[PDB]
Structure formats: structure tokens, C-alpha cells
Design a protein around this ligand. Sequence first.
Ligand SMILES: *P(=O)(O)OC[C@H]1O[C@@H](n2cnc3c(N)ncnc32)[C@H](O)[C@@H]1O
Length: 361
Amino acid sequence: HHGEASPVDPLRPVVDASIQPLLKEHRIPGMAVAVLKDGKAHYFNYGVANRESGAGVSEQTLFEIGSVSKTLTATLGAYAVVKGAMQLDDKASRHAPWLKGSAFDSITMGELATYSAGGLPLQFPEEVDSSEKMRAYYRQWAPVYSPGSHRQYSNPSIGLFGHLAASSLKQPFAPLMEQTLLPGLGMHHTYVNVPKQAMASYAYGYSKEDKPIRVNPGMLADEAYGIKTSSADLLRFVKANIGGVDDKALQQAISLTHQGHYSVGGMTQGLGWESYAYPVTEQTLLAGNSAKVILEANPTAAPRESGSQVLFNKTGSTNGFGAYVAFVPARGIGIVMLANRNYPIEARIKAAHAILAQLAG
Ligand SMILES: *P(=O)(O)OC[C@H]1O[C@@H](n2cnc3c(N)ncnc32)[C@H](O)[C@@H]1O
């Protein structure tokens, strides 16, 4: 393609330099990247969304974002707090009669949200595949740790937080998310359940064997990892987390998600979002997103003091997809990286850190 005019955007070279190697090294079929600088969104798109159609990725392409969903679920919970339907210090069994009598009489909504209830596992046991079996699972569950003392990253934990927050608002989770929360965030192309009208924009994910796949159903998947979105909608979510939104209650909810509860190493756990003092070293960002922090129980330490420059981030994956978002309100910068391959978290962090450092100036 020589002889073509090169893109006009001054940020294109910076983003290409970090993203193109990544696509080639991990054989990523497609990636939508969106960056925020000086109030403005920039979109850089790579590759193909669906190898059957050959359609290129755009900033309207829908990707599974896996656990990045947890930031939206946390915002829904924070919205329930702002509306007075629940408090973070409520015992979880206050919001579910079927939980009365269990360990969840003495575990708070906040602890569920922040994976600190006492050792709920990363995933439901594969046998837990119905609502009835889910309820039984929680009632039988034996605490490993005292509430508040250890972070064990957990889909059953924040999934139950999101279930019960929706219940406190007297609406099922998915329609509450789609009809109240997402529209107020300006996310009009974001879904728990992708509707007919939007299916053509939905990428296929690609497994390590290059087979086309999409997310498998699971218990509390909607709450823990069930969002499909575009790079433009997720960057609008970043902007909502910096400059706010018109809905008064949703504004407060967003702010609540930034508040620190405790730290693990250099990472401070908020509601959904995980945060760092900024500027942040690649080493610190890698450690906070490392296998040790994701897969092991770590003791909770004092949260970082509030104020100064802070970076917020969240990783997420499904079998066919890999997502990352990071932003720094105090510098007005942010990045969204949505791919249809689940490629290593360390590579996401390296590229995002490098791009953000150039954007910061
Ligand atoms: P985040 O992206 O860190 O985690 C959510 C993803 O983990 C996988 N996941 C959760 N629970 C299960 C079960 N029961 N079975 C298979 N995979 C699971 C999904 O890839 C989520 O998107």
C-alpha cells in the first residue's frame, strides 16, 4: 500500500508502535483501540472482527470484555447505594432471605464487592450450573478467612454483590443494567445480551486453536463477566469516570467506585476499579495484575491515601477475547484495548503503560 496518504492523526504513530507488534506476536485477529487526550477520543482499529465476513474492526465493533464487566457491575452497586436501596456495610443476607442462617449473615455487601468476604473461589465449581444449585452452593460455603482479611479475586463474590444490588433495586440485573445504567453512561452500544439489531457488529472470539468462539453461559455471568461493548462506548465510560455525567445519582455512584478499600502491594482495590499512584512503573502495574494477585489469597493492607494523581484500570478476558482499560483523571488521559484473542495480561499492561506515558507529556 505505499503511495497512500498516511493517517493524519498525530497519535497514530505512538499507538501503532505499541499495538502492531502485539498483534503480530500473539496472532491477534482484530483489536479496537481508543485513547483519550486533551478531551478528545481517538480510534485506532486493526484487523478483522469476524473471519467469516472479513469485516474490519471499528470502534463500533462489539467485543466481550470479560471481567472489565466488573467495573460496570460495581457502578450498578454504587448506584443502589446512592439511591438508598443498600449500604456497603449491609450484611449480604439482608438482601436475600434465602441467605439467612448462612455465613452471609456476617459478610457485608462491600466485602462481596471487593473479593474480601473470606475466600470465595475464582470460579463456581463446574457442577454449579443452575440458580437452585447456586443458592445451595452459597449456603454450604465454608469461610476460609475472616471477613475483610484477605483478597481472593472471585466471580462468585462480586457476582453475588451485583445480583443482590439489583435485587435491592427490585429489578433483574440485565434489564437494570441495559435500561438504566448503561444509557446514563452514554453507552448506547453496550449489552449484557446483544440484540438482533446489533449482532452483525459482534466480533467472534478466537481460541488458541484459532477456532471462533463466544462466551459460554454460566451462573452470574451477567454480573461477573457478561458485557459486550465497543471501544467508543468503553472510552465514553472512561470519560464518565473523569468528567462525570448528567444523571445526578449516577455521578455519585461513579465517584464511589474510585474510593479505596484496601491495598495489595501497590494496587488499591476500589469497587470494580483497581488503582495505583500515577506515574506508575511498569513493574508495579505488572505486579498488581500478576498471577499472584489474580489467583492467590493476599492479605489486605491499608488503602492508598486519597488524592494526587491516580491511575485506574481493569483487565478482563473470555476464552476468545482479551480486554484492558486504564485511565488517569488528573491528566485527562485514557486507553481502551479490545481484542478477539485472549493474549497475555503482561502484554496488555506493557503496551498501555507505554502509550499512556507518551500521552501524559
Ligand atoms: P476476568 O476476565 O478476570 O474473569 C472472568 C472470566 O473467567 C472465565 N470464567 C469465570 N467463571 C468461569 C467458569 N465457571 N467456567 C469457565 N470460565 C469461567 C470466563 O472466561 C470469564 O469471562
